[PDB]
Design a protein around this ligand. Structure first.
Ligand SMILES: O=[N+]([O-])c1ccc(O)cc1
Ligand SMILES: O=[N+]([O-])c1ccc(O)cc1
Ligand SMILES: [Fe+3]
Lengths: 166, 325, 324, 167
């Protein structure tokens, strides 16, 4: 019987960099489940960065505050069940500087706009987070998720603390 | 930049056609791909060769350096391409024995495609893992033009959006691979309010990857500016050693891979990176890398598609490692 | 300090069906596609077909002469009675960094475990002494064995093939039909007429015929002997499964067809030369290089050896046996 | 009938060679035995391999040779064309060849003293024992190529600068 091995918040197994003639720091090696496990709920920790772009890791637990962005973003559920709520902003420029990049925390209070819909993600499901929408998450049990985004006001960097230095 | 390529004779005994591009010559026999250029020669086992050729063709010369092996490969200049022998080999370079020629891309690509078609025989799929396909050995025997002509799949924004690249199903020709038989196939629950159905969108990405019909083929599934999520399913050995002209990132989504990491310029071994589910690491712009995977596994390759990067890395205005700590 | 003998049969994996093994600080594991090697401080992978083909040779040749590199990383050095197993010893990158590891064994101890690995890892219908077109595949989970293919008796002439009491000529009747890629090779015995009383020293045989009937590839086998001079011809197809770094000069005489030799520096592994040999070409592989051969069609090669145990020291304390 | 096994010949051979990445071609001592024999005088034994005392010698047989003998075994391999080997068991081998010496000795055209041992007819790819204590001679109707497994001696002609690849 074929068994495909997936990670989870409470069940992962880090590999790492084996050295011949290098510095393990060059490979910026971490495990996204570990990063999520040690963070505040909905804290978005950069696990990858290339110029301005980032991949962020986060533990979904309880209900998030609202987010919006001046560009598209994508979220990939990695572990448990995560609910996504989408709201079409009446004046999105009231909450997000159009010149800004990366997600903006726009408050716990309900912003003004129309209901777009609801998404329920399980492990391995990706949803779009469209520019001009506000979004928020609800997870009953802790679950892990990743963001394809740009570094901005919500992006927490802590490389020395999450990466292998061997 | 050169444009001169040529179909040579069908060999009477082997049944295969021989080919020329600039100063380079291509011939295969029962076992081998035989390369010549002004001043030298090289042999690559035909299976290894066809697997690598298949990638360089499917990827449109990809990014940076696609090394077929420790001697032969290509450098993508994006509209133009360099083909080389020993350019990234310390032995050839120290001796001034490396050779390279610069081509217009569609000129080298057209002869690469002709090579791949002529040299691929009945029942051999150079895009598959060895357990999934036949053998390339012997004299010319039919062809496999279907396997080598697969249509490239790229999302403009995200898989499954109206008018974007579609979800994979049994009905559209993509069943689940045998080594992903246990992977959950359900789609995420999507419920849009009236008028918003075009923009409330989600899909099962792991199930999408479970249905990929090829190995080692990064395909764009979601886009944010120049930032590309290019996941793929992998098995056996990456048929090339990739020396990128930018930094790139790997996130292991299932099972595991080891990356054999060598110096881009010299080819000297430098590290081996073992990645299991959830591991994310970066490949520096001064290394080349080649992956190994026992079981068919899911991998996310994350690229920055910006054309400014290579001249920046060259100048030292962009770092060879994206982050230091 | 002495040479080592600690080897062990580790556990049998329940899904793959294969057993893993230990020799000193080295562990040996194979799965569907690969041979996985570990030593203290390091790890390596070799595709299982290449590994088995190379393992086959090291076993059959009793560790051979000097260095038998499986690839750019892993191999053995013969000290004749003792044997060093290594990772990275002949690789400039590992060595410059102090990451090469080597362990010295009693030859009998290392061989016994090599034979166990080779037996367990080789599956039904796969013959690692054959060319790829001649045999099946080694991929996937354990499925039977091919112990007969890996248990072939070495053949060695004491004086010459066909002499009374010496190693016999090959025929269909004694299990040695002509190979498909030598179908056109003439198979007549030479004319031999002995006067009464002299029938034991008037002797001749068809050597090309004898080679055309070899059932293995890349296996130097003694056909005639003069002191330490050994004529070791063999039939070759595909790629020589190892990169041989010799502790002496060895000579190659191409008897039929064509071989290309990839020639690299013995210590670093850097490419130095490529040698093309067609019928009648004779050349010397110096002591300071390693080499690997490529043969499209099954071809006849004479490997000429000087088996004198005094040479490695004399060479260490010329490199090419003819200076000009 | 598609399989063709390519064998060389005095009149039809195609030399290969050494391509250099970073080395000296001389280190490889490269020659073709058919070329060597075609340039030599009849029955002249030109060394084509050397490993300490031991040699491989190449020769062109043409007509009848003088007799030879040796203090040790030797072997002859026919490489192209038909060669006859005549064997004579010497009465007193020490009268013709110094034992404790090595390599073949040319012992003259005149028949040596002893008994008829036998006759061997070799074609391409056939190898014969040249046994210690015997005198041997060759006859070849047309030029034929041959190879000896022996030791450097009195008949061994050395000329590596002329036969091998220097560039
Ligand atoms: O060049 N690369 O880093 C690659 C290429 C293909 C693949 O499937 C994975 C990684
Ligand atoms: O010494 N060698 O590299 C070899 C080993 C085996 C063979 O069949 C020919 C040459
Ligand atoms: Fe890459």
């Amino acid at each position: 019987d074929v068994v495909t091995e997936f990670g989870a918040l409470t069940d992962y197994r880090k590999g790492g960099v084996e050295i011949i003639d290098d510095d393990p720091r060059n490979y910026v090696f971490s495990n996204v489940f570990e990063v999520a496990a040690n963070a505040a709920p909905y804290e978005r920790v950069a696990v990858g960065k290339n110029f301005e772009y980032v991949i962020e890791s986060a533990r979904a637990e309880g209900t998030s505050g609202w987010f919006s962005c001046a560009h598209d973003e994508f979220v990939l559920a990695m572990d448990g069940q995560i609910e996504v709520h989408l709201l079409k902003l009446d004046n999105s420029d009231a909450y997000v500087d159009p010149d800004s990049e990366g997600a903006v925390a726009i408050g716990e209070a309900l912003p003004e706009g129309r209901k777009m819909g609801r998404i329920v993600l399980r492990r391995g499901h990706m949803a779009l987070l469209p520019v001009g929408a506000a979004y928020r998450f609800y997870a009953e049990q802790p679950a892990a998720m990743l963001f394809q985004s740009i570094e901005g006001a919500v992006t927490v960097q802590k490389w020395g603390e999450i990466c292998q230095t061997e | 930049a050169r444009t001169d390529t040529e179909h040579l004779a069908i060999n009477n005994e082997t049944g295969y056609r021989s080919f020329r591009a600039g100063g380079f010559t291509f011939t295969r026999d029962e076992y081998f791909a035989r390369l010549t250029w002004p001043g030298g020669s090289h042999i690559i086992p035909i299976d290894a060769f066809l697997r690598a050729m298949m990638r360089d063709v499917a990827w449109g010369f990809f990014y940076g350096v696609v090394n077929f092996d420790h001697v032969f490969g290509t450098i993508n200049h994006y509209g133009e391409v360099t083909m080389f022998a020993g350019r990234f080999n310390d032995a050839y370079r120290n001796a001034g024995r490396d050779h390279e020629e610069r081509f217009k891309s569609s000129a080298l690509m057209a002869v690469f495609k002709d090579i791949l078609s002529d040299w691929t025989v009945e029942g051999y799929d150079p895009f598959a893992a060895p357990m999934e396909t036949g053998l390339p050995w012997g004299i010319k025997n039919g062809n496999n033009d279907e396997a080598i002509s697969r249509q490239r799949v790229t999302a403009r924004r995200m898989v499954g959006l109206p008018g974007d690249t579609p979800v994979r199903t049994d009905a559209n020709g993509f069943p689940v691979n045998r080594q992903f038989a246990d992977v959950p196939q359900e789609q995420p629950v999507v419920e849009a309010e009236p008028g918003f159905e075009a923009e409330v969108s989600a899909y099962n990405l792991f199930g999408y990857l479970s249905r990929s019909d090829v190995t080692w083929n990064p395909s764009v599934c979601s886009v944010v500016g120049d930032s590309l999520f290019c996941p793929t399913s992998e098995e056996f050995i990456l048929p090339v050693e990739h020396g990128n002209d930018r930094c790139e990132w790997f996130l292991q989504l299932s099972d595991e891979i080891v990356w054999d990491v060598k110096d881009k310029e010299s080819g000297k071994p430098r590290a081996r990176v073992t990645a299991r589910a959830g591991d994310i690491c970066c490949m520096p712009a001064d290394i080349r890398h080649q992956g190994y995977s026992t079981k068919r596994s899911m991998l996310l390759v994350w690229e920055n598609g910006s054309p400014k990067i290579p001249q920046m890395i060259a100048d030292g205005t962009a770092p060879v490692v994206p982050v230091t700590f």
